[PDB]
Design an enzyme around this catalytic site. Structure first.
Site, PDB file in Angstrom:
ATOM      1  N   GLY A 143       0.787  -1.227   0.000  1.00 15.97           N
ATOM      2  CA  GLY A 143       0.000   0.000   0.000  1.00 15.97           C
ATOM      3  C   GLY A 143       0.821   1.280   0.000  1.00 15.97           C
ATOM      4  O   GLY A 143       1.868   1.349   0.645  1.00 15.97           O
TER       5      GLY A 143
ATOM      6  N   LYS B 253      -4.538   5.114   2.537  1.00 18.68           N
ATOM      7  CA  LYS B 253      -3.710   4.041   2.000  1.00 18.68           C
ATOM      8  C   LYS B 253      -4.383   3.506   0.744  1.00 18.68           C
ATOM      9  O   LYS B 253      -5.491   2.977   0.809  1.00 18.68           O
ATOM     10  CB  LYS B 253      -3.583   2.918   3.033  1.00 18.68           C
ATOM     11  CG  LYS B 253      -2.512   1.885   2.739  1.00 18.68           C
ATOM     12  CD  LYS B 253      -2.468   0.855   3.872  1.00 18.68           C
ATOM     13  CE  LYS B 253      -1.273  -0.065   3.796  1.00 18.68           C
ATOM     14  NZ  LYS B 253      -1.205  -0.986   4.961  1.00 18.68           N
TER      15      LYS B 253
ATOM     16  N   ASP C  59       5.600  -5.388  13.531  1.00 20.67           N
ATOM     17  CA  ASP C  59       6.460  -4.505  12.746  1.00 20.67           C
ATOM     18  C   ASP C  59       6.694  -3.187  13.484  1.00 20.67           C
ATOM     19  O   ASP C  59       6.522  -2.123  12.910  1.00 20.67           O
ATOM     20  CB  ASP C  59       5.859  -4.279  11.354  1.00 20.67           C
ATOM     21  CG  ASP C  59       6.837  -3.882  10.270  1.00 20.67           C
ATOM     22  OD1 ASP C  59       8.062  -3.941  10.526  1.00 20.67           O
ATOM     23  OD2 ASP C  59       6.371  -3.524   9.148  1.00 20.67           O
TER      24      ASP C  59
ATOM     25  N   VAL D 226       0.678   5.273   0.986  1.00 17.54           N
ATOM     26  CA  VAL D 226      -0.129   6.195   1.784  1.00 17.54           C
ATOM     27  C   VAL D 226      -0.056   7.646   1.283  1.00 17.54           C
ATOM     28  O   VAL D 226       1.025   8.226   1.188  1.00 17.54           O
ATOM     29  CB  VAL D 226       0.190   6.089   3.287  1.00 17.54           C
ATOM     30  CG1 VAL D 226      -0.759   6.954   4.102  1.00 17.54           C
ATOM     31  CG2 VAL D 226       0.117   4.642   3.749  1.00 17.54           C
TER      32      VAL D 226
HETATM   33  C1  LIG Z   1       2.767  13.742   7.870  1.00 15.25           C
HETATM   34  C2  LIG Z   1       3.312  12.394   7.647  1.00 15.25           C
HETATM   35  C3  LIG Z   1       4.585  12.117   7.205  1.00 15.25           C
HETATM   36  N1  LIG Z   1       4.668  10.762   7.141  1.00 15.25           N
HETATM   37  C4  LIG Z   1       5.833  10.008   6.733  1.00 15.25           C
HETATM   38  N2  LIG Z   1       3.534  10.141   7.512  1.00 15.25           N
HETATM   39  C5  LIG Z   1       2.686  11.134   7.824  1.00 15.25           C
HETATM   40  N3  LIG Z   1       1.391  11.015   8.246  1.00 15.25           N
HETATM   41  C6  LIG Z   1       0.671   9.817   8.454  1.00 15.25           C
HETATM   42  C7  LIG Z   1       1.013   8.634   7.802  1.00 15.25           C
HETATM   43  C8  LIG Z   1       0.289   7.455   8.035  1.00 15.25           C
HETATM   44  C9  LIG Z   1       0.626   6.236   7.426  1.00 15.25           C
HETATM   45  C10 LIG Z   1      -0.120   5.112   7.749  1.00 15.25           C
HETATM   46  C11 LIG Z   1       0.124   3.782   7.250  1.00 15.25           C
HETATM   47  C12 LIG Z   1      -0.782   2.773   7.012  1.00 15.25           C
HETATM   48  N4  LIG Z   1      -0.172   1.629   6.568  1.00 15.25           N
HETATM   49  C13 LIG Z   1       1.107   1.930   6.547  1.00 15.25           C
HETATM   50  N5  LIG Z   1       1.338   3.212   6.959  1.00 15.25           N
HETATM   51  C14 LIG Z   1       2.649   3.821   7.056  1.00 15.25           C
HETATM   52  N6  LIG Z   1      -1.165   5.130   8.601  1.00 15.25           N
HETATM   53  C15 LIG Z   1      -1.500   6.302   9.182  1.00 15.25           C
HETATM   54  N7  LIG Z   1      -2.580   6.297  10.070  1.00 15.25           N
HETATM   55  C16 LIG Z   1      -0.783   7.485   8.943  1.00 15.25           C
HETATM   56  C17 LIG Z   1      -1.044   8.715   9.550  1.00 15.25           C
HETATM   57  N8  LIG Z   1      -0.359   9.856   9.325  1.00 15.25           N
END
Ligand SMILES: Cc1cn(C)nc1Nc1cc2cc(-c3cncn3C)nc(N)c2cn1
Lengths: 288, 280
Positions: free
Chosen positions: B21, B38, B134, B23
């Site tokens: 996935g 995602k 993880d 995001v």
């Molecule tokens: C501003 C910002 C900068 N980055 C790198 N990520 C940010 N924000 C963010 C990323 C998310 C990523 C995922 C996710 C779901 N499956 C794998 N992943 C990684 N799930 C969430 N609930 C998230 C909530 N907020």
């Protein structure tokens, strides 16, 4: 041999994405990555470590590495250009096949084309490191070409967020997997030959051996299990012999590309030109 | 079921790639609210593995330290696309925080705050029989309100990821052929994450992942490079990294540990982090 700007040399059209050579309009395949200033610096040293080898009909010619300077504030983009191959991968060919199996003559044809391009890389002291169905491509015609994005210094694997990733284990030869009695993961040229015997099984069965395991259990088993075998008993004595020749457990006792190129399953292909026709005919039908 | 999913057309917009996935930084059209979306291409055979992650999120994401699930949508295509919508953590990940810092390290009081929040979210999952599997600096995120949230349940498969945060018992060898998992493997990844905060990188960062994978089961438990840390912190790292999982503490026992429990600046630490995010 220089990390330059893509402007004027290559352009994208819309992980690999389609592009074009601006000068002749010649099609291109551009691999796109996201790099930091540290990763862009690391690519500069690794480009100096690149080995020189000539163009080849069985290898999708490697053009070069470029840095698309953009966007300001965010991570920059690294581009790896290579010759364009239209009819897709061998994996796609098998997926888009009747019983998800190929004709023994098709497998012999593609394996010789894999070994031909491997032999090219091995005389120039270059290990491919990732021979599998997904990295063997078919051009507009029935041409078989090995994927190459700077395989001499593995430019597509050393940088990016997925560089630290162990990866998919199913085509890994026993020696590349560190285990008890193998503490130093030795990539040898003969490691591509194990990967070629695994690719041949993938052509015959649709998927490589142990595909039903979680990738970590398969990684543990590849160095311990006896060499993988073809499930069906339909196949000829020449096919079983070829798989048995590639899948020698100990690389010190595995043959070279040169010896496998003289194996009767690879050497004796009387219907070579007929097989090359029905491959292009399959490509044509798929295009619709 | 996936057939009852609506097209996200007048509901959400994919703004800019934030993670993986894959995001995206997503926005609700009606209000302008920021959400993490995602996006994953549903192959008609994977409609079971993708479903399992959605069930976990709907079932346990409501907790304070788990990024809350919003909803799911399917954008049809002539291979459809699934949109897993959840909470948007504005600050980014702990990995990004440490690397965007002078001397690429974190303060011991910050390490204790974040470590307690990871253990809080993990305690909730372990209560309900879920092993995250993880835990790392990439999957621990911060909201704009400087809150701690665990993300990525797409592990609890064709490519083995990064080895550095893996507890020894998850890596099979002759003595451990079946790679005997337990919820206590998350407590090892928490300890690796506390070292990643304290030193910028995990304990075997300068090695090829395949050599790190071979070495993790064979090496004694990692330790911090610097002597500066308190006896409380070294003892916490020792607790997370008890080499044989049979004698590794629980998530409850780790929450009671003096480096987690004795936190005097609880409400004040939050303020220095809230100021660091402001930098643009
Ligand atoms: C501003 C910002 C900068 N980055 C790198 N990520 C940010 N924000 C963010 C990323 C998310 C990523 C995922 C996710 C779901 N499956 C794998 N992943 C990684 N799930 C969430 N609930 C998230 C909530 N907020």
């Amino acid at each position: 041999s220089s990390l330059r700007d893509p402007a004027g040399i290559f352009e994208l059209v819309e992980q690999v994405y389609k592009g074009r050579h601006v000068k002749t309009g010649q099609l291109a395949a551009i691999k796109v990555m996201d790099v930091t200033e540290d990763e862009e610096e690391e690519i500069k040293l690794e480009i100096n470590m690149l080995k020189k080898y000539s163009h080849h009909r069985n290898i999708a010619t490697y053009y070069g590495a470029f840095i698309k300077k953009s966007p300001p504030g965010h991570d920059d983009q690294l581009w790896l250009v290579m010759e364009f191959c239209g009819a897709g991968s061998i994996t796609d060919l098998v997926k888009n096949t009747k019983g998800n199996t190929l004709k023994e003559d098709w497998i012999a044809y593609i394996s010789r084309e894999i070994l031909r391009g491997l032999a090219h890389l091995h005389i120039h002291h270059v290990i491919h490191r990732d021979i599998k169905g997904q990295n063997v491509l078919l051009t507009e015609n029935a041409e078989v070409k090995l994927v190459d994005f700077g395989v001499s210094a593995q430019l597509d694997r050393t940088v990016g967020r997925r560089n630290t990733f162990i990866g998919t284990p199913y085509w890994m030869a026993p020696e590349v997997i560190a285990c008890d009695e193998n503490p130093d993961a030795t990539y040898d040229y003969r490691s591509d030959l194990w990967s070629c015997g695994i690719t041949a099984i993938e052509m015959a069965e649709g998927a490589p051996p142990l595909c039903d395991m979680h990738p970590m259990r398969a990684l543990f088993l590849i160095p311990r299990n006896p060499p993988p075998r073809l499930k069906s008993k339909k196949w000829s004595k020449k096919f079983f012999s070829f798989i048995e020749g590639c899948l020698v457990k100990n690389y010190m006792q595995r043959p070279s590309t040169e010896q496998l190129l003289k194996h009767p399953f690879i050497r004796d292909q009387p219907n070579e030109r007929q097989v090359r026709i029905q491959l292009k005919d399959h490509i044509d039908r798929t295009r619709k």
